[PDB]
Ligand binder design. Structure first.
Ligand SMILES: [Cl-]
Lengths: 111, 244, 240, 231, 235, 243, 224, 240, 241
């Protein structure tokens, strides 16, 4: 049987400061006991001063990050280059993720 | 494109009339006269066939009087083919209702259904309406004996006696003159035939030019019987009533 | 499907098919609605060109949409049945999902929305019908009377008439209906409704139908004799 | 005459009158100018107001970071087509990690407009577009007509009185093509070009709309006190 | 006959131009934008004295920060309002924020040209969409059936419109207060209305940042009408 | 009368006037030609320079289908593009199923049946383009020309547009004076000349020459555009012949 | 959902100072049966990209046609098809990556692991992996299936991190690849002696080498 | 290609006429004479094989068609329209009848099904009516021998004997005189050949006449439909 | 007068669009003829190449539908090719579904039933073509069947189509009136082709070169068209007797 999911390892860490935030992640990508890459970036600048990472199954992660980045682009087009606030970004991501409620994006996402 | 050739069958005239409905009624006015008369102990349906040659096989012929179920019949005026489309639809609705509720369809419900179909052709779809007017003769255990009519507009109304097709103006006056509420089936049979005999465009009214039917509860153990009269029986009732 | 745009604008900014639908309403038998203090009365004309009718089974001019709301109309009879069916279905659907019967304003707004839909949908003509929708909201004793028309507009009326010679009976109601003091009782309300019809009806009690709607789903249709007593009393006072 | 009831009917001289009437809607639209050098491409647009209480209708729409257009004619149609461009630009980026070529963008607009001119029921687009962009083969300017005809140019203008701006550019051709690595001087030439299409009214602060794309310049629109510099 | 989406020889859509004629026949609606709020006012125009005039709903709430006045075939506006409301609420669901007034207006206008042989004809109603957002402040927009929308400092639509617009031309300045704008809408309505202006045949409303969109009571408008009469008698 | 107001209506002659009106749009367009040579085909087109603002060599008119077929057309340019887009879909579906690249006669009928289909109904307009196309297949070189009606035939030479009579006369001389055949490099030169001679019918505005070719020897049976030195050599040859 | 039937094994690759090298053996296994000995699994696209494919061979042949078809389509209305608007490795990859993930998400995957190796317009080395799940990654050395376990360890001794790429010459890199292919032949039961190797250099262009063989084979310690 | 003709091409004119049906009947009038006669022990149907050219093989063009083993059909009017009705009639006799009941439909029902198809061309969007009138002769176990006519409108009538097309008025008068209720099948064939000779201009023989019978079973049953051979017709023409 | 624009009845009971499609039939100004031998069916047609720029090899109104069936068309080439492609498709589908080669007459009736549909349905125009199908059927023997825009179809002993069809028809009628048989009593198709050409020459009153004719021959298990040189041989034999 075909298993559509995989595990690409990795670990990410968000910490909110008083007038700043950090999102960190290791750059190792793996499958099982093999190293795929020792430098495969996982935490992305998505524009509008928002950083994102979707750790877990790297394909579903890349897909989601790509879709959100595009969601930022289309938010600018559709709302007169208005800045997407972080709380709005979060709600937008909820709908992206719940959209595949019955075939989930196999990722733990942090912005 | 195609718009060029569209008659636009479902529009209002400036006066607020539906062109095609009006013209379909004009069509129906030329069709053979059909009469329904409701008595206290039954309903009579009488109707005049048209054109007729000596070579028309009358005993296997049905252009006017059709059976919808065991309780309800119709008399037709207009395009026979158009009527048979609607009849087969009505025959189904009756059986759908029977299947659903395990009770025979009430006469008014069936009539409304058919009349709602006719209405649909006047409001949407871009098709010509059905060039048919029905007289519905039927019985149910709510209202007893019922007469209705419907016409291409999809409007239906209830009657004690009524005509459709040709010379309805003349027919309805003669019925309005001789009808009474306490009347009986045998009398209504006579009234129906007398009315047709006067309003006919033929020289005389004969058995070969008539279809005839009665819905009597007049049966053993209070059950409704439909009688579609055979050619020989229409000939007898013409002699009985003294028209031939 | 048949897609043809039948209701369209003309150079002067009129949608003729909607206006020609109003002419079908103008042709229809007169209907009137008069709301009292604690009731609404729907009066309706029955043309006497049709005798030998069976009044037991002939479709009555006033229709119940639910146990607390009624709909009368002027115009094409076949068209009215479609609006009545849709309204009745929506009345039960509202009870099913909101656990509360429709307000008269809601039911009106729905019917009016259906009429509007037919004026800018392809392949369909407008309804040749105007409605008077009357009743009482759930657990409410304020009377409600609304009017709709083919274009899809609707509004609330202290009293209103539609159909043939509605101009005349609206003339009558405009002078005879006082807003500061409406018909206090059912008697007064029915009387004013019959009077207003007698301006146009020009004939006996068989040609007038009356339906009285009161609060808490209390709807009753008056008989020929009950109406005939109002007809007798109005003309005896008039002889003076 | 008899052959202008719909887009599906050729005239006896081989003309499509509905397309020509759509073309007429552009001429009734306000003037806009396009021009480019080797490094930058500039749109200049004279925005039109309904009256003194009203805003000035926005003429310039962004399609991607490296591409956008100015409109003249039915603004809702420009919205439909710009949105279509945005999608094609976007599809190229998502599927091929590739910025859409300006030449290919024009080809896509052409074919979209064409379908509306050969089929019954619809109508031609009632708008003309000037698409500027900077892609892998440098700066580009396109002129879109709703007939379907798209044309790559050094400079042009469309709308009412656009012939005056178009003649000016035809004279200036050798000057403005050489304005490389200087955005402000290229905008000056575009503002001077659109000035030739003015009568009575002159370029005020909320009247003028300018956009620019280039080598190290994303597609950016300048309105209000941003364009006061060039008046 | 001829196509619904046909161009005239001048380069205009017939049906759109004819729907604009229907809007001229509508009752007057006036909008005035200020830095203290946007005021919307309408002529009710009851066809008979028996019509209960408070049931004439020509001013409508889209969201708490967006109001809407209409003029023309007002039945056509119901589906447009419905869309606008659904759009406002849906956007708040997806983004946890109020929707920009321009974005809402643009969403409404996207319906307008969806007609052909979709709906069978354009809308026969113009809208004044008034609102506030944090980016562009107090805004008034005019949404036509052509699909075009203009922003306005002030705007009149309907039967009194060109007369009212010329009046709004003279009267509007960028330093108008809300109270001034209220009286100014009442003034211009009274000018272009056939019947005499009172609290029962005219309605006011506004949208402020603090209190959001509010249709005015008949008692509140009545006091503003009385304030207007006195200030016009004052010189 | 009224037979010319709707597409797919037979007049009492037996004619479809809407197709014949599409032909008028073709006759109104610029000149385009095709020349069949020994082992291939050459296509050339007149591109009217409306203004000095037109970028030279950028607004390309000749279109490639698959990798071996060239298409050029006169008339409504978007209609030509629409037909080539369909041709590309046809050529793609053929190769997908049958592996081999689509033969030119096969491809010709694919366009032919599609253009013919637009004369069968009143809901569509006929194509406002005569399309000259061809290339090299397994059975050698083929040149075709396809009219608004759906009519097409094979040609030795083909020409359409405003300068078609001028061109046709020139093509007829070549057919007579070269029965053994014309070489690919010769055909490029001759194509340049014929567009230059056919420019006398569009003489008000100056023009830009565009030539393409498929040849089994010169391009490996693939469609390529004539560029640079070979284009300049053909322009020089053409300029010399008019003077 | 399917199962792979005829299969190809390891595709191995690495970056070096001026470009990339990619290699893959010429075998189409049918389970344990070494069925097809003449299968090319490196498929060049233009003169700047080589797509190396392992896994199901019928699905490879499908991908081969998609790439062939992509070249055709890029040429359409593109006067710069052999110049500025030619296909890039990054374009070719992204397309395939889109396809692979789309197909997995419809539960009907192309049963492959792919390495796109090439050189970009600006002279940058392009080397990126994609598989049947749409999982993508890049690294100075990339290898599929079996090679990931045996080839990568050897190739990473030459280029362990990014900073080693400029220090690695084409000779060193090509030796490392050919060495790795030998190690795989000894130890991969579903490999073959015969292979193809492709160098994509930013100066010397695409060099495609066919009919190579694993040689210098140490068996002599067996006899004991 | 959008079949945009979703609207009726047959509509009621102000006089109440359905133009296209009337015109379809005019087409039938122009068509060649065909007739039917019912005997006590059979039915006969007949028509003239109007050969379009002498080079044409008129044997290939069958005007008289078998619908079921016990039902036959002949026409006057447009041949191609007839052909597609015979196709649909044969098919409907299997799909809506034989595959359900395991037996062939009775004459009247098959007639009714054909009538339905012809009616639908009279009301459906984007079609003209059929330009034929059919004469359907047949036998079934419970109704016996029967003969029906079917017109473009969809209307159908049972006949003892009748004729349609070119010389139908004159032929019907001829049949009225000769027909009685005690005719044997041979007597009806004799009359059919006499009646058909009047309308035929040119050659009158077994090669120019098509004639079939519904009679006895020809050896579960044998088929009652039988098409008379060119020889069999000529034999009866000597006793004429 | 929209009864003349689409396929609906005029007051006379006529379909004018069908009648005008019949006139489009002669727009090519080509005459075809078909005759039957013992073992064969021969169809000949005029070939006119007016332009010198035309590749004369591509100018053809004869089509190989199946291996057994040939079809010549009288009418414009786009409608001819429309009809040809459909007939080929139908003949291929038939063989697939029913496991034997589509008979000539069955295809003719099929194409006729399609032509009928365009005369009843308004959105479709009739094709402006007459389709003469030929084969040597394995049951019926040599076969000629013809279809027209009306949707009529019939079998023929011999036939002729085009502007001068009446002249060719009467010429053929007169020959068969003499011989008193339904066919050309000849063993070789080569001589049946010679007959066909000879009787067209006599009927039309024009001589032919090899490039003025186009010939198709049906035999058992194949239909084929003759080359220019095959026709030249045929013309030589005619001249020599
Ligand atoms: Cl068939």
């Amino acid at each position: 049987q075909f298993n559509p999911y995989g595990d690409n390892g990795g670990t990410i860490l968000g910490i909110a400061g008083e007038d700043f935030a950090v999102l960190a992640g290791d750059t190792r990508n793996i499958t099982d006991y093999s190293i795929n890459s020792r430098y495969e970036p996982k935490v992305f600048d998505c524009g509008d001063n928002i950083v994102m990472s979707a750790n877990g199954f790297a394909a579903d992660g890349d897909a989601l990050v790509k879709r959100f980045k595009n969601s930022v682009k289309w938010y600018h087009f559709d709302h007169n280059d208005k800045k997407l606030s972080i709380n709005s970004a979060a709600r937008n991501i909820q709908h992206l993720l719940y959209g595949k409620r019955f075939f989930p994006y196999y990722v733990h996402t942090i912005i | 494109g195609s718009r060029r050739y569209d008659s636009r069958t479902t529009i209002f005239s400036p006066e607020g009339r539906l062109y095609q409905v009006e013209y379909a009624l004009e069509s129906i006015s030329h069709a053979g006269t059909a009469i329904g008369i409701m008595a206290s102990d039954g309903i009579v349906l009488a109707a005049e066939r048209k054109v007729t040659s000596t070579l028309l096989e009358q005993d296997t012929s049905t252009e006017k009087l059709y059976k919808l179920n065991d309780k309800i019949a119709v008399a037709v005026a207009g395009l026979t083919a158009d009527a048979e489309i609607l009849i087969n639809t009505a025959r189904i609705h009756a059986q759908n209702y029977l299947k659903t509720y395990n009770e025979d369809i009430p006469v008014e419900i069936l009539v409304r259904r058919l009349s709602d179909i006719k209405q649909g052709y006047t409001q949407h779809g871009g098709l010509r309406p059905f060039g048919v007017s029905f007289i519905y003769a039927g019985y149910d255990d709510r209202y007893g004996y019922q007469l209705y009519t419907s016409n291409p507009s999809g409007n239906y109304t209830g009657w004690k006696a009524i005509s459709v097709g040709a010379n309805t103006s003349a027919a309805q006056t003669l019925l309005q003159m001789d009808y009474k509420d306490d009347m009986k089936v045998d009398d209504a049979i006579e009234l129906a035939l007398k009315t047709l005999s006067k309003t006919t465009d033929s020289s005389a009214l004969t058995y070969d030019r008539l279809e005839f039917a009665t819905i009597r509860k007049g049966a053993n153990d209070g059950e409704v019987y439909q009688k579609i009269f055979k050619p020989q029986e229409i000939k007898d009732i013409l002699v009985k009533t003294g028209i031939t | 499907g048949y897609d043809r745009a039948l209701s369209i604008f003309s150079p002067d900014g009129h949608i003729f098919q909607v206006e020609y639908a109003l002419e079908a309403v103008k042709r229809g038998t007169c209907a009137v609605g008069v709301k009292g203090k604690n009731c609404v009365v729907l009066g309706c004309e029955r043309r006497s060109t049709l005798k030998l009718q069976d009044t037991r089974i002939t479709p009555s001019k006033v229709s119940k949409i639910d146990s607390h709301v009624v709909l009368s109309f002027s115009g094409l009879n076949a068209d009215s049945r479609i609006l009545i069916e849709k309204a009745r279905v929506e009345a039960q659907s509202h009870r099913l999902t909101l656990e509360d019967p429709v307000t008269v304003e809601y039911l009106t707004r729905y019917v009016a929305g259906v009429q509007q839909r037919y004026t800018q949908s392809g392949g369909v003509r407008p309804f040749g019908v105007s409605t008077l929708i009357a009743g009482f909201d759930p657990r409410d004793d304020e009377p409600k009377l609304y009017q709709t028309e083919p274009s899809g507009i609707y509004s609330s009326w202290s009293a209103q008439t539609i159909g043939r010679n509605s101009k005349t009976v609206r003339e009558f109601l405009e002078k005879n209906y006082d807003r500061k003091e409406p018909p206090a009782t059912v008697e007064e309300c029915v009387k004013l409704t019959v009077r207003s019809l007698l301006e146009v009806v020009q004939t006996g009690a068989k040609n007038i139908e009356i339906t009285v709607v009161k609060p808490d789903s209390d709807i009753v249709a008056l008989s020929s004799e009950e109406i005939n007593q109002y007809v007798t009393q109005i003309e005896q006072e008039k002889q003076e | 005459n008899n052959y202008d009831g719909d887009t599906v009917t050729f005239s006896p001289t081989g003309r499509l009158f509905q397309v020509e009437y759509a073309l007429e809607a552009i001429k009734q639209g306000s003037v806009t100018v396009g021009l480019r050098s080797n490094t930058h491409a500039v749109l200049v647009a004279l925005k039109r107001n309904a009256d003194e209480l009203s805003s000035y209708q926005k003429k310039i729409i962004k399609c991607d970071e490296h591409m956008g257009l100015s409109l003249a004619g039915l603004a809702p149609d420009a919205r439909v087509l710009s949105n279509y461009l945005r999608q094609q630009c976007n599809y190229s980026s998502l599927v091929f990690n590739r910025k859409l070529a300006v030449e290919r963008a024009g080809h896509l607009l052409c074919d979209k407009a064409q379908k509306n001119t050969q089929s019954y029921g619809g109508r031609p687009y009632g708008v003309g577009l000037l698409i500027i962009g900077y892609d892998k083969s440098g700066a580009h300017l396109l002129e879109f007509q709703p007939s379907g005809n798209v044309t790559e140019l050094y400079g042009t203008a469309i709308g009412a009185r656009s012939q005056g701006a178009k003649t000016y550019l035809e004279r200036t051709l050798d000057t403005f093509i050489k304005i490389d690595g200087n955005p402000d001087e290229l905008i000056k030439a575009g503002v001077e070009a659109i000035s030739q299409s003015l009568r009575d009214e002159s370029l005020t602060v909320d009247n003028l709309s300018i956009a620019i794309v280039g080598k190290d310049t994303p597609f950016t629109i300048y309105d209000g006190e941003a364009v006061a510099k060039y008046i | 006959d001829r196509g619904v989406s046909t161009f005239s020889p001048e380069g205009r859509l017939f049906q759109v131009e004819y729907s604009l004629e229907a809007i001229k026949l509508g009752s007057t609606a006036i909008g005035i934008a200020t830095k203290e709020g946007v005021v919307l006012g309408v002529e009710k125009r009851a066809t008979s004295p028996l019509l209960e005039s408070d049931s004439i709903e020509k001013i409508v709430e889209i969201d708490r920060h967006i109001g809407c006045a209409m003029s023309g075939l007002t039945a056509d506006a119901r589906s447009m309002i419905e869309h606008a409301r659904t759009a406002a609420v849906t956007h708040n669901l997806y983004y946890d924020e109020d929707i920009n007034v321009e974005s809402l207006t643009q969403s409404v206008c996207d319906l307008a040209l969806r007609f052909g042989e979709l709906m069978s004809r354009p809308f026969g109603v113009a809208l004044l969409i008034a609102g506030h957002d944090a980016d562009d402040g107090y805004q008034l927009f005019h949404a036509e059936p052509s699909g075009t929308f203009y922003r306005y400092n002030a705007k009149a639509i309907g039967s009194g419109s060109e007369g009212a617009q010329a009046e709004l031309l003279n009267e509007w300045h960028s330093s108008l207060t809300l109270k001034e704008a209220e009286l100014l809408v009442l003034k211009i309505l009274k000018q272009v209305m056939e019947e005499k202006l009172d609290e029962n045949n005219a309605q006011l409303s506004c949208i402020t940042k603090q209190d959001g969109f509010k249709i005015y009571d008949n008692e509140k408008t009545a006091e503003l009408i009385k304030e207007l009469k006195e200030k016009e008698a004052a010189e | 009368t009224g037979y010319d107001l709707s597409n797919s209506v037979f007049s009492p002659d037996g004619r479809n006037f809407q197709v014949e009106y599409a032909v008028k749009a073709v006759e109104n367009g610029t000149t385009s030609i095709g020349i069949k040579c020994n082992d291939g085909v050459v296509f050339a087109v007149e591109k009217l320079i409306t203004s000095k603002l037109l970028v030279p060599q950028k607004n390309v008119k000749i279109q490639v289908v698959d990798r071996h077929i060239g298409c050029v057309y006169s008339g409504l340019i978007p209609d030509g593009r629409h037909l080539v887009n369909r041709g590309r879909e046809e050529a793609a579906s053929f190769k997908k199923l049958y592996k081999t690249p689509i033969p030119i006669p096969a491809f010709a009928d694919r366009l032919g049946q599609y253009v013919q289909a637009h004369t069968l109904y009143n809901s569509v307009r006929p194509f406002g383009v005569s399309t000259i196309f061809g290339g090299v297949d397994k059975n050698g070189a083929h040149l075709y020309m396809l009219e608004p009606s759906g009519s097409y035939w094979g040609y030795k030479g083909a020409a359409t547009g405003k300068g078609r009579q001028s061109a046709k006369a020139e093509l007829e001389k070549l057919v007579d004076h070269h029965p053994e055949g014309l070489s690919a490099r010769e055909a490029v030169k001759q194509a340049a000349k014929i567009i230059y001679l056919a420019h006398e019918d569009n003489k008000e505005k100056d023009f830009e020459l565009e030539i393409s070719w498929c040849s089994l020897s010169e391009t490996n049976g693939l469609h390529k555009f004539v560029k640079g030195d070979l284009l300049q050599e053909a322009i020089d040859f053409a300029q010399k012949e008019i003077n | 959902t399917q199962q792979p039937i005829v299969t190809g094994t390891s595709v191995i690759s690495m970056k070096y100072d001026n470009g990339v090298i990619i290699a893959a053996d010429n075998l189409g296994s049918y389970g344990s049966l070494l069925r097809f000995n003449g299968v090319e699994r490196l498929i060049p696209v233009g003169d700047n990209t080589v797509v190396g494919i392992s896994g199901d061979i019928s699905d490879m042949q499908h991908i081969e046609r998609l790439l062939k078809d992509l070249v055709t389509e890029n040429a359409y209305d593109n006067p710069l098809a052999d110049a500025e608007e030619a296909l890039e490795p990054s374009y070719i990859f992204e397309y395939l990556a889109t396809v692979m993930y789309q197909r997995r998400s419809k539960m009907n995957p192309l049963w492959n692991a792919i390495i796109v190796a090439g050189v970009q317009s600006n002279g940058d080395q392009f080397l990126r992996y994609v598989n049947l799940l749409g999982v993508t990654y890049s690294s100075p050395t990339l290898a599929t299936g079996f090679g990931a376990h045996m080839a990568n360890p050897l190739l990473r001794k030459v280029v362990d991190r990014e900073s080693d790429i400029p220090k690695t010459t084409v000779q060193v890199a090509e030796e490392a690849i050919v060495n790795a292919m030998r190690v795989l032949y000894y130890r991969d039961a579903r490999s073959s002696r015969n292979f193809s190797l492709a160098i994509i250099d930013k100066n010397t262009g695409l060099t495609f080498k066919k009919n190579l063989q694993v040689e210098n084979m140490k068996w002599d310690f067996a006899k004991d | 290609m959008t079949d945009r003709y979703s609207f009726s091409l047959t509509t009621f004119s102000p006089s109440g006429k359905l133009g296209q049906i009337d015109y379809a009947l005019t087409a039938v009038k122009q068509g060649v004479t065909s007739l039917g006669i019912k005997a006590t022990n059979g039915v006969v149907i007949a028509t003239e094989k109007k050969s379009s050219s002498p080079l044409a093989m008129s044997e290939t063009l069958s005007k008289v068609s078998l619908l079921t083993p016990d039902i036959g059909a002949v026409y006057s009017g447009m041949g191609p329209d007839y052909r597609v009705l015979v196709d649909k009639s044969r098919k409907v006799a299997h799909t809506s009848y034989k595959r359900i009941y395991g037996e062939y439909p009775p004459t009247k029902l098959l007639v009714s099904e054909v009538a339905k198809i012809m009616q639908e061309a009279t009301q459906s969007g984007g079609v003209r009516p059929f330009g034929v009138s059919l004469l359907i002769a047949g036998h079934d176990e419970f109704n016996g021998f029967s003969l029906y006519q079917v017109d473009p409108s969809g209307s159908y009538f049972p006949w003892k004997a009748t004729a349609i097309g070119k010389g139908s008025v004159a032929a019907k008068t001829f049949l009225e005189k000769r027909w009685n209720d005690e005719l044997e099948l041979e007597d009806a064939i004799h009359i059919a050949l006499l009646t058909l000779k009047e309308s035929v201009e040119g050659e009158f023989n077994g090669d120019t006449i098509e004639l079939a019978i519904i009679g006895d079973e020809n050896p579960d049953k044998g088929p009652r439909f039988r098409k008379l051979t060119s020889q069999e017709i000529n034999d009866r023409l000597e006793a004429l | 007068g929209y009864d003349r624009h689409i396929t609906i009845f005029s007051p006379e009971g006529r379909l004018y669009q069908v009648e005008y499609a019949f006139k489009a039939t002669n727009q090519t100004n080509i005459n075809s003829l078909a005759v039957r031998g013992k073992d064969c069916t021969v169809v000949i047609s005029q070939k006119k190449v007016p332009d010198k720029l035309l590749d004369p090899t591509t100018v053809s109104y004869i089509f190989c539908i199946s291996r057994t069936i040939g079809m010549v068309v009288n009418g414009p080439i786009p409608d001819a090719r429309n009809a040809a492609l459909r007939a080929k498709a139908e003949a291929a589908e038939f063989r697939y579904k029913y496991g034997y080669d589509m008979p000539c007459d069955v295809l003719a009736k099929r194409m006729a039933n399609l032509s009928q549909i365009y005369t009843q349905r308004a959105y479709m125009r009739p094709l402006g073509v007459i389709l003469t199908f030929v084969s040597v059927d394995e049951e019926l023997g040599p076969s000629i069947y013809k279809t027209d825009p009306a949707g009529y179809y019939v079998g023929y002993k011999a036939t002729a189509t085009g502007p001068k069809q009446q002249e060719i028809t009467t010429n053929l009628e007169n020959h068969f009136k003499k011989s008193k048989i339904d066919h050309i009593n000849e063993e070789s198709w080569e001589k049946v082709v010679e007959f066909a050409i000879t009787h067209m020459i006599d009927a039309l009153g024009t001589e032919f070169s090899k490039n003025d004719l186009e010939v198709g021959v049906a035999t058992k298990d194949k239909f084929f068209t003759l080359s220019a040189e095959n026709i030249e041989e045929r013309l030589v034999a005619i001249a020599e007797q």
